[PDB]
CSV table of C-alpha atoms in Angstrom, one decimal:
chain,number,residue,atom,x,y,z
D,51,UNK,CA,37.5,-29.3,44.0
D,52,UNK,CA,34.8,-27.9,41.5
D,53,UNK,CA,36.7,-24.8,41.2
D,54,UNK,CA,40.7,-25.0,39.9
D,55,UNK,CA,39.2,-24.8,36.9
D,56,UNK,CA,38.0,-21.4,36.5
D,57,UNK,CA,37.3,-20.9,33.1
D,58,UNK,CA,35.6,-17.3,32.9
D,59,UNK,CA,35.6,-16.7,29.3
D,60,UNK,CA,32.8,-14.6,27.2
D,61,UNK,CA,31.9,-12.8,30.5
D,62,UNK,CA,32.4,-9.7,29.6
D,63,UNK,CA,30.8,-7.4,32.1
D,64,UNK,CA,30.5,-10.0,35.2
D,65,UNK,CA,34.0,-10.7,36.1
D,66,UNK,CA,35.3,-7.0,37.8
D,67,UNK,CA,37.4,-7.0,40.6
D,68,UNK,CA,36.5,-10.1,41.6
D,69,UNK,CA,39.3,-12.7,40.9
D,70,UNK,CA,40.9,-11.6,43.9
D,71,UNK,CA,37.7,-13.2,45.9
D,72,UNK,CA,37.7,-16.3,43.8
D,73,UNK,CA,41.5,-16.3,44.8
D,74,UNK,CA,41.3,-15.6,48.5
D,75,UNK,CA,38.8,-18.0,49.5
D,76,UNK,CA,39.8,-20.9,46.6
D,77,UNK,CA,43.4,-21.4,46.3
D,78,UNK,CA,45.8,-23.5,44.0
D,79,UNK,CA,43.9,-23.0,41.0
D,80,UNK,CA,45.8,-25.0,38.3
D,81,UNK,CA,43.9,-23.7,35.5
D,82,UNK,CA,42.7,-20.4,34.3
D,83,UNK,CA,40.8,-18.8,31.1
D,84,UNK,CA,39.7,-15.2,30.5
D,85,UNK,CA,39.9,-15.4,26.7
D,86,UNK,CA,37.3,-12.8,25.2
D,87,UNK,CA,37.4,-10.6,28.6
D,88,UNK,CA,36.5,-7.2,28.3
D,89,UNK,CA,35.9,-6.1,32.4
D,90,UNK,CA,39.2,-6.8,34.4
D,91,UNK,CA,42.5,-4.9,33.6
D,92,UNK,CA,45.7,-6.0,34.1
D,93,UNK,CA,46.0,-5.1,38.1
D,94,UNK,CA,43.1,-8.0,37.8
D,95,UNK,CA,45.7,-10.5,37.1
D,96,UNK,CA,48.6,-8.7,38.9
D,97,UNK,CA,46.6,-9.6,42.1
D,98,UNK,CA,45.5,-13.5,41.1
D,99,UNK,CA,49.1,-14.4,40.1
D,100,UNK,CA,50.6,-13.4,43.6
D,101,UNK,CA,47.0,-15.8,44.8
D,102,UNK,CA,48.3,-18.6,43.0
D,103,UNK,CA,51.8,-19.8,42.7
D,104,UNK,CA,50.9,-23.1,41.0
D,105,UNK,CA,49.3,-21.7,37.4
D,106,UNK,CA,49.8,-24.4,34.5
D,107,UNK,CA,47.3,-23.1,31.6
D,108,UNK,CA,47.3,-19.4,31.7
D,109,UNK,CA,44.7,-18.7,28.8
D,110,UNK,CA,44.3,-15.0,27.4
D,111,UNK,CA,43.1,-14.8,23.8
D,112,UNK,CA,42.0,-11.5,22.9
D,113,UNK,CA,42.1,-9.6,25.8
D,114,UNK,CA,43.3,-6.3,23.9
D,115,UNK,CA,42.8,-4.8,27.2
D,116,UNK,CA,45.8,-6.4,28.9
D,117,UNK,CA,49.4,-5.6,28.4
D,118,UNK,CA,53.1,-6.7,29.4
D,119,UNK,CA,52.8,-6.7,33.3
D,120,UNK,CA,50.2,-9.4,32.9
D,121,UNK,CA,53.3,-11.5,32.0
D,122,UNK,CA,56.0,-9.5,33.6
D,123,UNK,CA,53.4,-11.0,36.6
D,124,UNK,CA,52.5,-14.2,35.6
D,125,UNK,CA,56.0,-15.4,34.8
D,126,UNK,CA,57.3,-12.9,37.6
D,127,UNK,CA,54.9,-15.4,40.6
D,128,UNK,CA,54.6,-18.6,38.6
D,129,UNK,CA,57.9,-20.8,38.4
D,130,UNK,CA,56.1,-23.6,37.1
D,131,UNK,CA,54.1,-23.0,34.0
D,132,UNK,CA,53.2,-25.0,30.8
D,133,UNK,CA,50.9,-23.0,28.9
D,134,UNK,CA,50.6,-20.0,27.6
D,135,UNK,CA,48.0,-18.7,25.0
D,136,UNK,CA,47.6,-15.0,24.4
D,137,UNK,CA,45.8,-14.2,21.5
D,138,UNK,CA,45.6,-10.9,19.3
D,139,UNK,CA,46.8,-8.8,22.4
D,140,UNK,CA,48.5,-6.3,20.4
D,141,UNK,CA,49.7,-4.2,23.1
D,142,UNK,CA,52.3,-7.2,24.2
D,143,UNK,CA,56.0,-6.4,23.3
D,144,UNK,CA,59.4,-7.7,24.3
D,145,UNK,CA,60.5,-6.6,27.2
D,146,UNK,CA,57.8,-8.7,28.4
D,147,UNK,CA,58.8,-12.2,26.6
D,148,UNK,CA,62.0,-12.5,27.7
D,149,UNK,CA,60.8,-12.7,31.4
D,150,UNK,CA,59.0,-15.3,30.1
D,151,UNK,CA,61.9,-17.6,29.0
D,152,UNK,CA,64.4,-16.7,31.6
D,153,UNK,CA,61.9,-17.5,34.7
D,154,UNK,CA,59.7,-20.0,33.3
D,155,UNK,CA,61.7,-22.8,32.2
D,156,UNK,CA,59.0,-25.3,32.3
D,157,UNK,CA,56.7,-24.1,29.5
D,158,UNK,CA,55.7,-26.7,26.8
D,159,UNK,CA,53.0,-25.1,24.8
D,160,UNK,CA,52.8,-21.1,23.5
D,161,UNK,CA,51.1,-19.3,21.4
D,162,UNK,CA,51.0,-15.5,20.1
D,163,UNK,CA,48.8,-15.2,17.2
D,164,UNK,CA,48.8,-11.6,15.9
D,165,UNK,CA,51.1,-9.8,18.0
D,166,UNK,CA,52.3,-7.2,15.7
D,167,UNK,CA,55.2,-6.3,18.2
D,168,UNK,CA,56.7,-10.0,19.1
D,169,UNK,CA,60.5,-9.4,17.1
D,170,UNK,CA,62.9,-12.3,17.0
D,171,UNK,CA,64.6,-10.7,19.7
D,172,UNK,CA,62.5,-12.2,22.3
D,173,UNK,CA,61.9,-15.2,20.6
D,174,UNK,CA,65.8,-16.2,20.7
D,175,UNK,CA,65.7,-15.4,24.8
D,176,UNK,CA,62.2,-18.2,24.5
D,177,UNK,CA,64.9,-20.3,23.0
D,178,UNK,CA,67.2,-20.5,25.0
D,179,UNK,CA,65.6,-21.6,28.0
D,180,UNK,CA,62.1,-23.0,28.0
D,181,UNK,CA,64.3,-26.1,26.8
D,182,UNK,CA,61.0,-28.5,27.3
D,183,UNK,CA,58.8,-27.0,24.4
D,184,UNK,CA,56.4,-29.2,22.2
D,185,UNK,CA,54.1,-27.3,20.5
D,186,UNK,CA,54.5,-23.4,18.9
D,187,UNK,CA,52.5,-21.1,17.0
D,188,UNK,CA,52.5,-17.4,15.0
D,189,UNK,CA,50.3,-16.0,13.1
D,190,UNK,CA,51.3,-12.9,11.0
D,191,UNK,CA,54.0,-12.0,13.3
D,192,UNK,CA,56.7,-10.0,11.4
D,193,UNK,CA,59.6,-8.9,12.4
D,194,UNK,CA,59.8,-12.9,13.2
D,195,UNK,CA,62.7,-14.2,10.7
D,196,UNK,CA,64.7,-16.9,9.8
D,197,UNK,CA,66.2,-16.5,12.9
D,198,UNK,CA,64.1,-17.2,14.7
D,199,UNK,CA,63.5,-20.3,13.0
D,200,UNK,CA,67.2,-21.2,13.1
D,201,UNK,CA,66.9,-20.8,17.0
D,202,UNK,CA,64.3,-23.1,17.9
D,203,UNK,CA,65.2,-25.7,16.0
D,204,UNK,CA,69.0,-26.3,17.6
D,205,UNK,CA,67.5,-25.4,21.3
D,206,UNK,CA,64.1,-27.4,20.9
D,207,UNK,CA,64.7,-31.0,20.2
D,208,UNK,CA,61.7,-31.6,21.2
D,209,UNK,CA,59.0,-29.9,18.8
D,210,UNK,CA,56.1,-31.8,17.9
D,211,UNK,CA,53.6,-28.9,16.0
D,212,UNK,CA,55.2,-26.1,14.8
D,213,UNK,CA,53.3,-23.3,13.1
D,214,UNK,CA,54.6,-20.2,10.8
D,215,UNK,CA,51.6,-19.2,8.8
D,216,UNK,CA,52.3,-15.1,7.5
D,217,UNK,CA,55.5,-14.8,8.7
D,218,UNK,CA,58.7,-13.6,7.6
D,219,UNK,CA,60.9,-16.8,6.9
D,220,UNK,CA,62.0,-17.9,4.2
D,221,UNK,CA,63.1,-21.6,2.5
D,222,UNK,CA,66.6,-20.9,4.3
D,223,UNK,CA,65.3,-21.0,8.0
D,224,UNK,CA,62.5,-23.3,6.8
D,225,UNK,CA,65.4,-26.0,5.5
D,226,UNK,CA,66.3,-26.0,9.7
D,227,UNK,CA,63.5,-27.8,10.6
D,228,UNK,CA,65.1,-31.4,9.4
D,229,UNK,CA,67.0,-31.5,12.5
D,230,UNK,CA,64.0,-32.0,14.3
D,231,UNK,CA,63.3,-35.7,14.7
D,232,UNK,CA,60.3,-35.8,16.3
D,233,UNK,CA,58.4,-33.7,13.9
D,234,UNK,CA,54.4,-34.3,13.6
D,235,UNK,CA,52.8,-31.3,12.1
D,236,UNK,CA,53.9,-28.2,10.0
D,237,UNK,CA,52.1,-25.0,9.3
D,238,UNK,CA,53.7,-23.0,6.5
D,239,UNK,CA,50.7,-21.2,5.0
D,240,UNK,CA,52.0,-18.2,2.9
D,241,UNK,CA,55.1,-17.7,4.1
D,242,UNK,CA,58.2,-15.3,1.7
D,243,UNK,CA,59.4,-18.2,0.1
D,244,UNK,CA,59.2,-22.4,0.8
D,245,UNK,CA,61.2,-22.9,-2.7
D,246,UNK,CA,60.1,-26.8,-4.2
D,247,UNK,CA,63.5,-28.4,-2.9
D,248,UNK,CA,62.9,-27.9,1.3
D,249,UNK,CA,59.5,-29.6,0.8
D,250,UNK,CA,60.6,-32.7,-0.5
D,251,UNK,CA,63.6,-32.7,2.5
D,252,UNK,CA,61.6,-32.3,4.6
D,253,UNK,CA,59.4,-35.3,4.2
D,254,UNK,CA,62.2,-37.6,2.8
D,255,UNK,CA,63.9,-37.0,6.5
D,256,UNK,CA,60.8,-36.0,9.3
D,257,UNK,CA,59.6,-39.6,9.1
D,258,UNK,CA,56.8,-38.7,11.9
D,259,UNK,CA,54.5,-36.2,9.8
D,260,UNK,CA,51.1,-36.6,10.0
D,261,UNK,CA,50.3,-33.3,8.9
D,262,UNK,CA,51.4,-30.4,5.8
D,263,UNK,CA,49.5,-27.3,5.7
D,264,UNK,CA,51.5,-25.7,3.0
D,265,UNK,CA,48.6,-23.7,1.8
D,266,UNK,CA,48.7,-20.2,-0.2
D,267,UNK,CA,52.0,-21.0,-1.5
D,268,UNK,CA,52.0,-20.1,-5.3
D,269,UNK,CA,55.4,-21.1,-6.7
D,270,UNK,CA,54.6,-25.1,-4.6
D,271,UNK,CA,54.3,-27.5,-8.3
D,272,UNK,CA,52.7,-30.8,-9.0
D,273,UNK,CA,56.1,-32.7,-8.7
D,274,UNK,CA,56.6,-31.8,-5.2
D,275,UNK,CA,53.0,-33.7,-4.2
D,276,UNK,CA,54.2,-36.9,-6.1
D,277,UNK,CA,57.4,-37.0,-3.9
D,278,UNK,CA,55.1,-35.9,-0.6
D,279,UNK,CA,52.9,-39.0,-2.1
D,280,UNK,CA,55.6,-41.6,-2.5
D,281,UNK,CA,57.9,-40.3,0.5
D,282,UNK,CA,55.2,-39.8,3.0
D,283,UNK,CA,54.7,-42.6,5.2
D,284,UNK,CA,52.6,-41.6,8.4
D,285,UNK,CA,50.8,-38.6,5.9
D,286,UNK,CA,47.1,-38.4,6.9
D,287,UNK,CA,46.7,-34.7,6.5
D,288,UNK,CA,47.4,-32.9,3.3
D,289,UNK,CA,46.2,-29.2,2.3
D,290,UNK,CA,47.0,-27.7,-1.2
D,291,UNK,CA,45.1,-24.6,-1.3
D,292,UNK,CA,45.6,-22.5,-4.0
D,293,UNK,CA,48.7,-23.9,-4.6
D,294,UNK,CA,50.1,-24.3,-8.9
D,295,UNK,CA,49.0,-27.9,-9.1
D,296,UNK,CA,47.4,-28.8,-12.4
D,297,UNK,CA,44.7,-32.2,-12.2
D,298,UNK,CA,47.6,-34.7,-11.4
D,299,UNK,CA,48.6,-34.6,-8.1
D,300,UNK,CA,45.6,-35.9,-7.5
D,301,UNK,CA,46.2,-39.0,-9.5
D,302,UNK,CA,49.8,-39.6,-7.7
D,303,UNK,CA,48.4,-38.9,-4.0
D,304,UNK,CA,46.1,-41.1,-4.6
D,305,UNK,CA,47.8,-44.2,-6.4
D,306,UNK,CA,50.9,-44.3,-5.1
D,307,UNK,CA,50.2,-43.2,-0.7
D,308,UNK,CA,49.5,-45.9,1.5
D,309,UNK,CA,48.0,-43.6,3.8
D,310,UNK,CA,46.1,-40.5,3.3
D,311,UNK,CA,42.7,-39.3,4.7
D,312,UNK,CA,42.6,-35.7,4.0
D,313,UNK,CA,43.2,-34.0,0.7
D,314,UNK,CA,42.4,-29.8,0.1
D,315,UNK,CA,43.0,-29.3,-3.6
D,316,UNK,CA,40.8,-26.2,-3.6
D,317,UNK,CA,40.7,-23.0,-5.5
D,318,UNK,CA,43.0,-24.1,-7.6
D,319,UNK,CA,42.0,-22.4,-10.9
D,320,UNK,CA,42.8,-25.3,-12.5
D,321,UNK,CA,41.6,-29.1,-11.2
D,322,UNK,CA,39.5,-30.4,-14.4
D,323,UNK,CA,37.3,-33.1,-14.1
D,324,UNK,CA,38.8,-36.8,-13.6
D,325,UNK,CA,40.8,-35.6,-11.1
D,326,UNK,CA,38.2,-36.7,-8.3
D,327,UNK,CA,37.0,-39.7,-9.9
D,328,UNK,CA,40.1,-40.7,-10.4
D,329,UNK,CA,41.5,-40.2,-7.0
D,330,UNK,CA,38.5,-42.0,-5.5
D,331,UNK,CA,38.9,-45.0,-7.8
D,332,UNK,CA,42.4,-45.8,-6.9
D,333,UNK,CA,43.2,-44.5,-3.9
D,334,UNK,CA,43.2,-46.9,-1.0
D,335,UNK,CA,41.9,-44.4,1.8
D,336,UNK,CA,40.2,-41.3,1.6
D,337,UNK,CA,37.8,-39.7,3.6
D,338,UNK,CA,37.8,-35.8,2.6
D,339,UNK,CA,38.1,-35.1,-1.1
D,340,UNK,CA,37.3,-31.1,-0.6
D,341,UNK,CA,37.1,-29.6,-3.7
D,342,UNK,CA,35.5,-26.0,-3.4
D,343,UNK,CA,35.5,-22.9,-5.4
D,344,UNK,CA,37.1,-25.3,-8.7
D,345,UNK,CA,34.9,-23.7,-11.2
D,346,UNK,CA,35.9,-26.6,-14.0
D,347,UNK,CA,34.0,-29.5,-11.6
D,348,UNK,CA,30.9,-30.8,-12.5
D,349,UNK,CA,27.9,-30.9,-10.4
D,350,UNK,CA,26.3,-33.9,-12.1
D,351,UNK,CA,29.9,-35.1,-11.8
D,352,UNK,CA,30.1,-34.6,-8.4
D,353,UNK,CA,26.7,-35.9,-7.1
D,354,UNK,CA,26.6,-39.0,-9.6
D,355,UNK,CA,30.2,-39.8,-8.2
D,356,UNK,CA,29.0,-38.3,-4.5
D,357,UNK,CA,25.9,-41.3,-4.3
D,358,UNK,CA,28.9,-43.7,-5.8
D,359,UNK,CA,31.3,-43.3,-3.4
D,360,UNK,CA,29.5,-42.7,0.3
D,361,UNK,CA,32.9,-43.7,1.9
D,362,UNK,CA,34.4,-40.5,1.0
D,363,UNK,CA,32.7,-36.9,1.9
D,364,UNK,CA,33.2,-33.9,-0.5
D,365,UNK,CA,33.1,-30.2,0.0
D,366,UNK,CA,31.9,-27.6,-3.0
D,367,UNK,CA,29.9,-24.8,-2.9
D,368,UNK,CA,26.7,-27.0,-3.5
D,369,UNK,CA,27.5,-28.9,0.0
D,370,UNK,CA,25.3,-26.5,1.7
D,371,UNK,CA,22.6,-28.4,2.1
D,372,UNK,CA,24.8,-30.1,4.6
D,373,UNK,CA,24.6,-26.8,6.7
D,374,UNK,CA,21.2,-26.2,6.0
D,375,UNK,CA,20.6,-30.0,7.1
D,376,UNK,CA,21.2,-28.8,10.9
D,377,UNK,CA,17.7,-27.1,10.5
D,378,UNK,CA,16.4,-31.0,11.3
D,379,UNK,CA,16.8,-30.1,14.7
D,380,UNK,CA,15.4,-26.6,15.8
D,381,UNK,CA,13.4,-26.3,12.3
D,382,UNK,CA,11.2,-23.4,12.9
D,383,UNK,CA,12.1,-21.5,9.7
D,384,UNK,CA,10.2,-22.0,6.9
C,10,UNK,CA,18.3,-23.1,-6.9
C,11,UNK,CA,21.2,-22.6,-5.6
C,12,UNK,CA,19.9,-19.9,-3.8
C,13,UNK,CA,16.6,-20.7,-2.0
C,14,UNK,CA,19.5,-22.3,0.4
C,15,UNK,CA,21.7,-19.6,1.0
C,16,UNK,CA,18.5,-17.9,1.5
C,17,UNK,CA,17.8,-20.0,4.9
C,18,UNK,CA,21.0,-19.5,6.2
C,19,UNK,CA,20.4,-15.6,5.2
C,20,UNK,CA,17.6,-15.6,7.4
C,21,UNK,CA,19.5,-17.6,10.2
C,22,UNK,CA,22.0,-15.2,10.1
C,23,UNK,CA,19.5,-12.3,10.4
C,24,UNK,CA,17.9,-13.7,13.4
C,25,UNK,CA,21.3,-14.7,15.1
C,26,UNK,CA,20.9,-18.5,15.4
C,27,UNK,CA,23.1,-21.2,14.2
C,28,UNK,CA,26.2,-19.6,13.0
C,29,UNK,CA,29.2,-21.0,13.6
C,30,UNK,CA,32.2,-18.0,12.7
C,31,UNK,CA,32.6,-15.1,15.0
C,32,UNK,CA,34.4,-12.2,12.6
C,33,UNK,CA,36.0,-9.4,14.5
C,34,UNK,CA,36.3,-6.0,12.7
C,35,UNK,CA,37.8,-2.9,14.6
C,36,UNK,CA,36.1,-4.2,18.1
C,37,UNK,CA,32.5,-5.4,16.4
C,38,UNK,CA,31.6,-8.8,16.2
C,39,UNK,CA,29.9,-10.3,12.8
C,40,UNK,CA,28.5,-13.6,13.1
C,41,UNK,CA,28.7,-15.8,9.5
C,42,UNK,CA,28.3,-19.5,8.8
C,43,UNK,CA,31.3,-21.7,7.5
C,44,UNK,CA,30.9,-22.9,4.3
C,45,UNK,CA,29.4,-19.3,2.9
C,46,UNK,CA,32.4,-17.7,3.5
C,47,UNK,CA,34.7,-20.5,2.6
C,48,UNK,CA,33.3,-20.0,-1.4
C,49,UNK,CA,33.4,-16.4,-0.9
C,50,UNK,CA,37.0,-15.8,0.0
C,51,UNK,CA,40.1,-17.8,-0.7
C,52,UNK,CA,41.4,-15.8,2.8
C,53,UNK,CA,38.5,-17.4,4.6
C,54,UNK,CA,38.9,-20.8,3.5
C,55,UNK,CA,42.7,-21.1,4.4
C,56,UNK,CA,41.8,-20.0,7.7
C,57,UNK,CA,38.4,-21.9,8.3
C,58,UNK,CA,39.7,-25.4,7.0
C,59,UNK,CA,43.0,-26.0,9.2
C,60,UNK,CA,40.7,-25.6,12.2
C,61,UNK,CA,38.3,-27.8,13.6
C,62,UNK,CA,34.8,-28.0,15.0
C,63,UNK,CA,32.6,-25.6,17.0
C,64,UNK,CA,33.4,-22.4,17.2
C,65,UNK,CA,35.6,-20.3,15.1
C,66,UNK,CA,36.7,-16.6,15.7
C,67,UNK,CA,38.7,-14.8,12.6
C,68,UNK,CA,40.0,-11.4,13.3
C,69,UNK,CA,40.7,-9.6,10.3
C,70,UNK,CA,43.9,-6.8,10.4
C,71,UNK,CA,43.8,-3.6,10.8
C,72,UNK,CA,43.0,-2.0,7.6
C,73,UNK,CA,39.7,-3.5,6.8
C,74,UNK,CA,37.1,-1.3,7.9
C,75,UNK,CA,33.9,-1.8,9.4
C,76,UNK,CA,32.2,0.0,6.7
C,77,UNK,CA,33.4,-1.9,4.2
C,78,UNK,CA,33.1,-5.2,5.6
C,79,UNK,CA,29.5,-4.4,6.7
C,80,UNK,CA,28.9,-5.2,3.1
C,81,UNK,CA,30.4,-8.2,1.0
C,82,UNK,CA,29.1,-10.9,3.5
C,83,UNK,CA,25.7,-9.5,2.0
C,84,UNK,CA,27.2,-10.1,-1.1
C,85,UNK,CA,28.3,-13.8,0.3
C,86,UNK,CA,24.1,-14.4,1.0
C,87,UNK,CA,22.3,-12.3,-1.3
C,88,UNK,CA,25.2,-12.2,-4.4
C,89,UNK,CA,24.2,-8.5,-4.7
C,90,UNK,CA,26.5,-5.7,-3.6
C,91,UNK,CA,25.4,-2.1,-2.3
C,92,UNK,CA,27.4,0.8,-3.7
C,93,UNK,CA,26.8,4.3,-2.7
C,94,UNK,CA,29.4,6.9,-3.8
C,95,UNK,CA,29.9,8.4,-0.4
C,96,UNK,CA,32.0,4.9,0.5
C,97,UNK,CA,33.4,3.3,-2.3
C,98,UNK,CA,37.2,3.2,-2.0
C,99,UNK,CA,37.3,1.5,1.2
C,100,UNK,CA,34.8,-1.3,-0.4
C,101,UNK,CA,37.3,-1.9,-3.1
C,102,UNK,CA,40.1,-1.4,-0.5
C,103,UNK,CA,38.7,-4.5,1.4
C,104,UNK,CA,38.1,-6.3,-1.5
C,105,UNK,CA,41.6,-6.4,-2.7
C,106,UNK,CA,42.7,-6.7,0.4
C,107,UNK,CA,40.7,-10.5,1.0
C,108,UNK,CA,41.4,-11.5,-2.4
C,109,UNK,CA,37.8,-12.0,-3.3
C,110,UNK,CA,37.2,-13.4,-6.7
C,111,UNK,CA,34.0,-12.7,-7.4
C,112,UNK,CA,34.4,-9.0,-8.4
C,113,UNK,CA,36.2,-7.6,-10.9
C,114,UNK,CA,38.5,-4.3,-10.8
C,115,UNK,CA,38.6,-2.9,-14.6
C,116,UNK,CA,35.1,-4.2,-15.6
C,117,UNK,CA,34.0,-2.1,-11.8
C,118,UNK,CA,35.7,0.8,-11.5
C,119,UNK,CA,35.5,2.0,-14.8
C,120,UNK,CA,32.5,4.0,-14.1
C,121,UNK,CA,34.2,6.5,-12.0
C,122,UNK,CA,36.4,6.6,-15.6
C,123,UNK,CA,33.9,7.3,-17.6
C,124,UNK,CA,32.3,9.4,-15.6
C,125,UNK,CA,35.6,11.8,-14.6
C,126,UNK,CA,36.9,11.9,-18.7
């Protein structure tokens, strides 16, 4: 009962052939995580996946060590998975996805973060089974296209995060992602091209966001915040990183959004003054006003307006007294 | 002023306690704090701000090099930069590769310029 929960990560040299003994004498383990591994290779899960046919949470981040037939087993022995989360294990292709979405149709979370190998080839074959998928996740994959995004939106009615930060798509197989009703969170951090019309219609029809990481996205304007601000009804999470918005945005997201909690306007080159104390004045919630790196703020401006408003925490460059404020526990230093 | 904090965290770093970023550079981990890097880089901070809590790995790609991201997160603490002619070029290359802001290009390199002409 205290094992089935394995969960062998950052132990790097003291997990050698050894899995096989925590398999033999402790079986049905439901749960498994060897993220950060550096010891076993991959006839160290080729062994532990014919020891347990019930796997659900099959966690590999950055194992570089590791290669396809760690999947070509795990999907191969495991008819009943729901998670899988490799991490930068460049090594992974596709001829080793594919017999992960024609075996395992049960899988409801993925995630392959810096794979530079994953094409859309395998990712149409993950779309057309693994019908029961909620949650997805690249990061810089390319050779991962617009369709790929126009595949996993008409096989996936169920998608609650989706996440495209680095890819290759562009606003055409972005502007597919209306026909998922059930929308909460999007990632589309500097991506080819997200246009300014898609944004808007994607918030006038997703009526379930709570999150919008468009972040690193140059050509985003102001008007497209005021529409996110007035069309945005279960908005709690908004992040405009380095994104063309010039100093009223954050007037409109924060005088006409009911509900809003989060707000990243940062290195933006330019956010003048005003901006933050006016934002704070009107709107109605707000308890993250990060600024950072906006070389026009005020410090004065933003301490006098900091021991005004308590409610609301702020984020510069100055607000590292808040990490060297941790030092009020070990101390020690000087 | 300002510094006189980023010198405690300097020292923290130094001594390996309290750091909450893991960075991963061909193999080699380098330990950093949060907010440091999140005013040194615009490709730190959209990677360090959609997350959330404890602790944080970022692996950068492939072309960044070990020996030129040994320096720059000196630069982060210390704001002072260490250039030796033998490497250079991959210094730059890293720096236009993570978009950092605090350095400038024609006002830099121009010393090679003058010197060669």
């Amino acid at each position: 009962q205290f094992w089935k929960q394995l969960d062998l990560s950052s132990r790097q040299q003291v997990t050698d052939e050894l899995l096989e003994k925590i398999a033999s004498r402790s079986q049905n383990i439901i749960e498994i995580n060897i993220s950060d591994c550096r010891s076993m290779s991959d006839n160290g899960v080729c062994v532990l996946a014919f020891k347990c046919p019930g796997l659900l949470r099959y966690t590999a981040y950055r194992c570089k060590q590791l290669s396809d037939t760690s999947i070509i087993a795990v999907a191969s022995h495991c008819p009943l998975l729901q998670k899988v989360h490799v991490g930068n294990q460049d090594k992974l292709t596709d001829e080793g996805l594919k017999q992960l979405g024609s075996k395992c149709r049960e899988l409801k979370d993925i995630h392959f973060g810096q794979c530079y190998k994953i094409s859309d080839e395998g990712m149409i074959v993950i779309a057309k089974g693994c019908l029961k998928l909620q949650r997805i996740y690249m990061q810089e994959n390319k050779l991962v296209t617009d369709q790929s995004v126009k595949a996993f939106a008409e096989h996936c009615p169920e998608l609650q995060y989706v996440g495209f930060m680095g890819c290759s798509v562009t606003s055409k197989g972005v502007i597919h992602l209306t026909k998922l009703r059930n929308l909460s969170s999007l990632d589309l951090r500097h991506i080819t091209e997200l246009d300014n019309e898609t944004v808007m219609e994607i918030v006038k029809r997703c009526k379930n966001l709570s999150s919008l990481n468009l972040c690193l996205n140059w050509i985003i304007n102001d008007r497209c915040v005021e529409v996110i601000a007035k069309e945005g009804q279960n908005l709690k999470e908004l992040y405009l990183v380095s994104c063309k918005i010039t100093d009223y945005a954050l007037i409109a997201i924060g005088r006409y959004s009911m509900t809003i909690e989060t707000v990243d306007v940062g290195w933006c080159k330019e956010i003048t003054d005003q901006g933050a104390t006016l934002i704070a004045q009107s709107s109605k919630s707000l308890r993250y006003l990060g600024l950072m790196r906006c070389d026009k703020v005020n410090e004065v401006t933003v301490e006098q307006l900091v021991q005004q408003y308590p409610h609301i925490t702020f984020s510069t460059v100055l607000q590292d007294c808040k990490r060297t404020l941790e030092r009020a526990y070990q101390m020690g230093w000087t | 002023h300002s510094t006189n904090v980023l010198l405690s965290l300097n020292d923290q770093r130094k001594k390996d306690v309290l750091c909450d970023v893991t960075i991963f550079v061909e193999g080699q981990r380098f330990r950093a704090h949060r907010s440091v890097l999140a005013a040194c880089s615009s490709y730190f901070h959209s990677r360090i701000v959609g997350q959330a809590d404890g602790e944080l790995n970022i692996t950068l790609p492939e072309e960044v090099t070990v020996k030129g991201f040994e320096p720059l997160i000196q630069f982060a603490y210390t704001a002072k930069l260490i250039l030796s002619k033998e490497n250079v070029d991959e210094v730059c290359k890293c720096v236009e590769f993570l978009s950092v802001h605090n350095i400038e290009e024609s006002c830099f390199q121009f010393l090679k310029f003058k010197f060669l002409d």
